[PDB]
Amino acid sequence: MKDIIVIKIGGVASQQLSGDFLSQIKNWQDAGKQLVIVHGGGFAINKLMEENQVPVKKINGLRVTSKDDMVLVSHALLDLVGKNLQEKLRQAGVSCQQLKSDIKHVVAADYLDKDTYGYVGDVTHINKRVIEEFLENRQIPILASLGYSKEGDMLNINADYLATAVAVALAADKLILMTNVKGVLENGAVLEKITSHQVQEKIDTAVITAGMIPKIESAAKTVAAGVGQVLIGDNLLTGTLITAD
Ligand SMILES: Nc1ncnc2c1ncn2[C@@H]1O[C@H](COP(=O)(O)OP(=O)(O)O)[C@@H](O)[C@H]1O
Numbered sequence: 001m002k003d004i005i006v007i008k009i010g011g012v013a014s015q016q017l018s019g020d021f022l023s024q025i026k027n028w029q030d031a032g033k034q035l036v037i038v039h040g041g042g043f044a045i046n047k048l049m050e051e052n053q054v055p056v057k058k059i060n061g062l063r064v065t066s067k068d069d070m071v072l073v074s075h076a077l078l079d080l081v082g083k084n085l086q087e088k089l090r091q092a093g094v095s096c097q098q099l100k101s102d103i104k105h106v107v108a109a110d111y112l113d114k115d116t117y118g119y120v121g122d123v124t125h126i127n128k129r130v131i132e133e134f135l136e137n138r139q140i141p142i143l144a145s146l147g148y149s150k151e152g153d154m155l156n157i158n159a160d161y162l163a164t165a166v167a168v169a170l171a172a173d174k175l176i177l178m179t180n181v182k183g184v185l186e187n188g189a190v191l192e193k194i195t196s197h198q199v200q201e202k203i204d205t206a207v208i209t210a211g212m213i214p215k216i217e218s219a220a221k222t223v224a225a226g227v228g229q230v231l232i233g234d235n236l237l238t239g240t241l242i243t244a245d
């Protein structure tokens, strides 16, 4: 126990944060726990694309993103999701800060496959030293799912991918992938537990589809690298538990 938890918050999930959620965060912070928050915003980016007349195309659960598209992506993530997260937490007495210009000094990335996906990135390195300044200061850093190429270009990163990189870089005790379903569902009920060795065969039988594909792959990659537990569900405490074994 390093006493470190990474919380990743999905698009819908960030717009419905409960009283239980807000108290649990404040109580962990008051008990000395070190907390880092990562968030996405697919539902918001989709809305914005419509309102601005661009076509949503995804491939393998990843959004095809042109350079013009990135203006839309960064606006929805920073101004339409991230600012609300920071305001709800501060109003509840949690000490925290949205990264904006600090993003380029923390998350390095490269193009996943330019010809297929455009400006979609894969994380290449996390600079721990600047996340550590916030934590040493008892303040929770809030990170949108964005990174920067070696040449300085902003890239769109699937939020689950960013959460794995962050949890692994800090050697976290636990990662929570909080979303808008109660667990990973199979045959009409929530699965209580799954090990990393069983994930591939549920993506092969297509039990798991769409956005739950990058979610469950990130969970498996995290425990495989030594993080003790990953939770997938709609809250901080109950849902599906994933372990290396
Ligand atoms: N086996 C499954 N169990 C649960 N959800 C699934 C499954 N297969 C596909 N999904 C879909 O994955 C979605 C969650 O991923 P996503 O839509 O990207 O949410 P988030 O914004 O939290 O990342 C669920 O809302 C559900 O529609």
Ligand SMILES: CC(=O)N[C@H](CCC(=O)O)C(=O)O
Pocket (backbone or CB within 6 Å): 010, 011, 039, 040, 041, 042, 043, 045, 061, 062, 063, 120, 145, 156, 157, 158, 159, 160
């Ligand atoms: C929707 C969307 O563009 N997703 C991301 C980033 C946001 C999120 O994960 O919620 C992506 O495909 O790369």
Ligand SMILES: [Mg+2]
Pocket (backbone or CB within 6 Å): 010, 040, 042, 211
């Ligand atoms: Mg998603």
